[PDB]
Amino acid sequence: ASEVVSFSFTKFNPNPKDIILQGDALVTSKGKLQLTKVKDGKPVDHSLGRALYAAPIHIWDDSTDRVASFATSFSFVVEAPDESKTADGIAFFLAPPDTQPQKDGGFLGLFNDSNIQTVAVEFDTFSNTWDPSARHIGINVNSIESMKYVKWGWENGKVANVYISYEASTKTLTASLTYPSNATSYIVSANVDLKSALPEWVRVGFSATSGLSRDHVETHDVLDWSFTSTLQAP
Amino acid sequence: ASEVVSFSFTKFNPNPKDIILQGDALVTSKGKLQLTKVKDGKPVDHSLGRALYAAPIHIWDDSTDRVASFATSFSFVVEAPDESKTADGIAFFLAPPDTQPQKDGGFLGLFNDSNIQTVAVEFDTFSNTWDPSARHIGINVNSIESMKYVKWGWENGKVANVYISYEASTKTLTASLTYPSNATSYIVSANVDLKSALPEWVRVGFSATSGLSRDHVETHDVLDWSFTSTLQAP
Amino acid sequence: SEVVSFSFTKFNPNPKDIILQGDALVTSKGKLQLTKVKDGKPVDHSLGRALYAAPIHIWDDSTDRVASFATSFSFVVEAPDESKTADGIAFFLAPPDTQPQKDGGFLGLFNDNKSIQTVAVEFDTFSNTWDPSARHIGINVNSIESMKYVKWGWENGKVANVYISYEASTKTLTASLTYPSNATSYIVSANVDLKSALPEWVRVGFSATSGLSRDHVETHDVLDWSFTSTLQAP
Amino acid sequence: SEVVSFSFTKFNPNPKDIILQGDALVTSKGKLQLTKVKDGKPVDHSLGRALYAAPIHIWDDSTDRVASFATSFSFVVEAPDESKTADGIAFFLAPPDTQPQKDGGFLGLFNDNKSIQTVAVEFDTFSNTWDPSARHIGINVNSIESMKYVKWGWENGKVANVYISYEASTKTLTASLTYPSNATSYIVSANVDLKSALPEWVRVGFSATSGLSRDHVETHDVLDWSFTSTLQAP
Ligand SMILES: [Ca+2]
Ligand SMILES: [Ca+2]
Ligand SMILES: [Ca+2]
Ligand SMILES: [Ca+2]
Ligand SMILES: [Mn+2]
Ligand SMILES: [Mn+2]
Ligand SMILES: [Mn+2]
Ligand SMILES: [Mn+2]
Fold first, then answer.
1. Beta bridge partners of B74
2. Breaks in chain A follow which residues, C to N over 2.5 Å?
3. How many whole angstroms separate alpha carbon D55 and alpha carbon A50?
4. CA A230 → CA A20, C70, C127, D125, distances in Å?
5. Cross-chain Cβ contact B10/A1 below 8 Å
6. What are the chain B neighbours of A9 within 8 Å (beta carbons)?
7. Which residues surround ligand 6, an ion (CB under 5 A)?
8. A56/B13 Cβ within 8 A
């Protein structure tokens, strides 16, 4: 049996009824998903915002031994008043349908220091204790510490085009980022067992936090988004 | 700007988290959407069940003057112990996202005698006072009385393949039904202004009722379903 | 699994992915003008066909796969005299090296002792000896005589929206025509075994002819076209 | 708007929608074997290419449209001697009447004084005079010398998953390669103006060559392939 879901937005409607907005997240009158707070054109500290697609996604099925393959593309911008003081980052993620925002700052709204099923591809702009020294793209499986990462030449206020795919038959999760402005790209892949990492139905979407001090502030804006998932026989 | 949503199920999972089940509706362990009650292999009277896709669908936008085109296919079966005593019918419909079940029997769970924004394509098995004498396929715009209908040679317990499309630029809503078992088909079309009939965001899905007397009973089972909607510039 | 899909909202003049035959041409406004027009008028004795450049794999013996496909297109037949129409337009599948066959009533598809492999849906505007009395939408399997038909109320000069689908698992071919100006619709279906009518690979497209008398002339214009075929395990 | 999409999970032997050139063939197991193997061994001096039968409309001057496209495929290069590999495999776009050009290091794509229109992503296994020192994934615009490249750690006999996309609005061509056995990935991007490198219509596909010495031999097998292109108003 086959179950396929697809969606695509070239720009978000300012009152998006098929997106669950959490924390500080909102859609601007020009159709930008602004995950973290912006006040008089400036990003604010201690901000956390997430946004999930309304329909839960069937990513595996015990009854029938199927596991989903999926892919997603999106464009985002992280713009910082000071390039030397960037925090904390933006992620694409999958979590249980009732998922709520979790700790702020370096925990990216995804994880906490207290409990969590979430798989995430993170675009981390600040080196915490569990991080490598550089900014990086990471693949995260039920932990804020990445299972694998690649160093990331972040370009302030430039559009980044991301493509993420999961191939169920090989358990391979791949994440790429490209800046058309200078045609530079980064990629990372990992072997991930979605089936032991997540429940059978998840919601998908984005999460981002700005830094916990006034001077570590940046935007996390998502400009568009496509997603497709197929759950079918092995 | 463009917003596109697609989904497709070749069979429903018995605990479908992306389907809102209402009234008596359930999914059988073999993956049939059984809208109305079945007890020891027999359909029960006074049953009403509906099922909606979890994500609201953006069908028009005042801000930008877009109106969606959409299409849907599904297969259904209506099986009656007595061919001379069939009631009441099954429909595909669009309604506001918070839509709840409405009156039973000939009102098909869609409309009532008390208030309703709903557009529906109905497969009516019993001739009420607002109906033509024969069983029929109808196009319904905010009323249980159809705006147009075609006579319908219902085939007891046979699979019916339906295709419904809405072409926004011509405001044309078309509904077809085909029985592969005897290669017989029916079609009806109508001019419909989705924009004045419905709010900007709707949910879509199915509704069905069995008759209000013990002897007017039939099943309303949906076997599979695909849906696609595109909201883009004129 | 092999899937092919293509979609044109209008045609490019000199389209390299369409094989044009006989008189067919694409106009500067992007219409596929299958039969000749000069000054402003359709001309007699014209025949034109257009096929998509890629062959389509419609069945595969080595794996017992049989394709399901769907096509949609919109066409116009304009006649200077309503009572003197000929001969019609058809969508068809034939072997990839298919060449134009008889003009006039044979629609460029067939011939009275050749054995021709071609499956077509015809929109016949002139009642030949082998035709029913009125204008008709017919399903034809390797013959100009239709295996099933439905009476067609042709609308002069008006856009017709056509949808054709073939469900492999039931061998059901369905053809529908809707005039959006009028919200008037017609449908016909037949059990057709593609496997025995046609080779494994076919070329799909259109064919039309104008009458063989100077007075029985009409245009046969295609305005858009989308096609999808899937060859998968049953 | 013109969209074309095709997808093969394996190849049919004698595929009528693929133009095979030089030594290319499809095996009974459904592999696209671009270079010759006899007994069990890859043979020297082999060249094979395969193109999809339909030309693809990649730009249109008359409307200032430029296509965005994406392709994914998985390939294997197996060598009996790890230290003696040549020459490589490439995905490419060229004019529709494209014919095989030089063997060996020219990959069947190029030639040292012809002016050849061909855009390619190459997976080069042998360092010629114009190449960097190591095995490399290169972007090539009408020359065998790559405009940009990234070092490629080839894995002998292992399945590589490739994704290539071209974003028209930024003229960004990106190419990624992932080994799912290893979860190891590589990416390279370049600004490429398709409009000036290539004609309006192209044929897409693959080309590969084995070394010109008897000792520098390897296979070049393609296992699947999906392609989508959209030509739309900017
Ligand atoms: Ca961090
Ligand atoms: Ca009724
Ligand atoms: Ca005729
Ligand atoms: Ca080389
Ligand atoms: Mn990190
Ligand atoms: Mn009714
Ligand atoms: Mn006829
Ligand atoms: Mn090279």
1. B162, B225
2. 115
3. 43
4. 22, 21, 49, 35
5. yes
6. 1-3
7. B 124, 131, 138
8. no
Min distance C223 CA to chain B CA atoms (Å): 15
Record the tokens describing residue D8, joined without a space. 């093969």
H/E element, A196: helix A194-197
User: What gap in Å lies between CA A140 and CA B37, rounded to an integer?
Assistant: 45
**8 Å CB contact of C53 and D57:** no
Q: For A66-171, list the strands marked E by DSSP.
A: 66-67, 69-77, 88-95, 119-124, 136-141, 148-151, 160-167
How far from chain centre, in Å, is Cα D18? 14
Domain segments of chain B: what residues?
1-234
- Which ligand sits closest to the CA of B140? 6
Resolution in Å, one decimal place: 1.9
Establish whether A15 is an annotated binding residue. no
CA of D145 to the centre of ligand 8 (A): 6
CB B211 within 8 A of CB B105: yes
CA distances from residue A128 to A134, A149, A211, D21 in whole angstroms, order as listed: 10, 14, 11, 55
Distance from CA of D7 to the nearest CA of C (A): 5
Say which CATH architecture domain A1-234 belongs to. Answer: Sandwich (2.60)
Tokens read off for C204: 């799909």
> Ligand 8 center to residue D181 CA distance, Å?
25
- Chain D residues with CB-CB distance to A170 below 8 A: 180-181
Structure tokens at D72: 């994914």
- Per-residue b or e along B116-144, where b marks 16 or more CB atoms closer than 10 Å to that residue's CB: bebbbbbbbbbebeebeeebbbbbbbeeb
Would you call A188 an interface residue with chain D, using a CB distance cutoff of 8 Å?
yes
Q: B5 to chain A: which residues are within 8 Å by CB?
A: 6-8, 18
DSSP assignment string, B159-216: -EEEEEEEETTTTEEEEEEEETTTTEEEEEEEE--HHHHS-SEEEEEEEEEE-SSTTS
Round the CA-based radius of gyration of chain A to a whole number and report it: 17
Token pair recorded at residue A180: 């058309």
What residues of chain B, 22 to 51, have a C-beta less than 8 Å from chain A? Answer: 31
Name the neighbours of D, counting chains with at least 3 Cβ pairs within 8 A.
A, C
DSSP state of B229: E
Q: Give the closest residue to D98 by CA, choosing from D228, D202, D227, D209.
A: D202
CA–CA separation, A85 vs A125, rounded Å? 9
Q: d(Cα B127, Cα B108) in Å, to the nearest integer?
A: 12
- How big is chain C by its Cα radius of gyration, in Å? 17
Amino acid at A120: A
Ligand 5 center to A91 CA (angstroms)? 10
My answer on whether omega of the bond before A24 falls inside 30° of 0, hence cis, is no
CA distance B202 to chain A (A): 9
CA C136 to chain centre: 13
- From start to end of chain B, where are the E strands? 3-9, 19-23, 26-27, 33-34, 38-39, 42-43, 48-53, 57-58, 60-61, 66-67, 69-77, 88-95, 119-124, 136-141, 148-151, 160-167, 172-179, 184-191, 201-210, 221-231
B–C interface: beta-carbon pairs under 8 A = 61
Q: Is A191 annotated as a binding residue?
A: no
Say if residue D129 is exposed, middle or buried (CB neighbours under 10 Å; 0-12, 13-18, 19+): exposed
Please tell me whether A131 is known to bind a ligand.
yes
Nearest CB to C172 within list B165, B180, B188: B180
Which residue in B182, B132, B192 sits closest to B160, CA to CA?
Answer: B182
Nearest residue to C15 via CA among C228, C158, C225, C202: C225
Indicate the SS3 state at residue C153.
Answer: coil
Ligand nearest the Cα atom of residue C123: 7
